[PDB]
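Notebook B, p. 112. Complex prediction, attempt 2.
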Amino acid sequence: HHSSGLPAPAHVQRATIDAFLDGWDKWTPEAFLATWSEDCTQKTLPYSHNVPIRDRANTNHLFPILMSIMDNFQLKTHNIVHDAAENKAAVYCSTTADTPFGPYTNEHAIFLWFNEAGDKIVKIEEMFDQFTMKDFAPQLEKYAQFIDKKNARA
Amino acid sequence: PAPAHVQRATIDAFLDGWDKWTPEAFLATWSEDCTQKTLPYSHNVPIRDRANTNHLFPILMSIMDNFQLKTHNIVHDAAENKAAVYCSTTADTPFGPYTNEHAIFLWFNEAGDKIVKIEEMFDQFTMKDFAPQLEKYAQFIDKKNARA
């Protein structure tokens, strides 16, 4: 389990957090994306690296491919900072997996904003282990493009 | 756990001291044993204790002119005596222009008036060059001061 070593009301937002971390750990598109609203964007931090904000269309296309190349995926949650009054949160997590490119590790400082009801996440900003992403980001991109050519041709 | 507005005044004096960019201003909210831990854990950066912080900052601040802080996000969990902020910075340094971004996690003491634990993730591409530059600058200052 991921939590082993660890404006709507608070318990409502927190259950959204928990379902977001739970779906992440479950590591299927449907389970992870269940808590993302239809307009939920993802922005990669730092701003200085100019990684463009990503809309749900691109996320929905990306995650099936990404999850399919990360086996034995394990999530570990180190810290949850929940600001119920401000309808937002921040978590720190670490991950491991085996990939077509070798062993994978990453860490995530993730910032979340919930909708008015507090049952969906509306905006995500996250800062990664930039040394992992230096190599992994172009490998994923080449892999996603290969998948697209394969599907478009059949 | 102290009431929410006490812990928040602490957060506010932290970022204001940072903005002020002097050792005394920035460090006023740090407990006397406050540790600093650089994230990600995978980079295996050793904890920086309070005495190391007190030596570093006067040198650090002296080589970062025109310093500007910008706070983008403050997340406060008063029930858990915790917080997280995201900030960006610019400065002029003897090594050229500097920019950085900071995802910082804070923990307060029981009174809510001091920060006792800090974990922070940087713009790792700034730090790749700046961290060795700053270390050698600090060794140079320590040689100059000793020979006196």
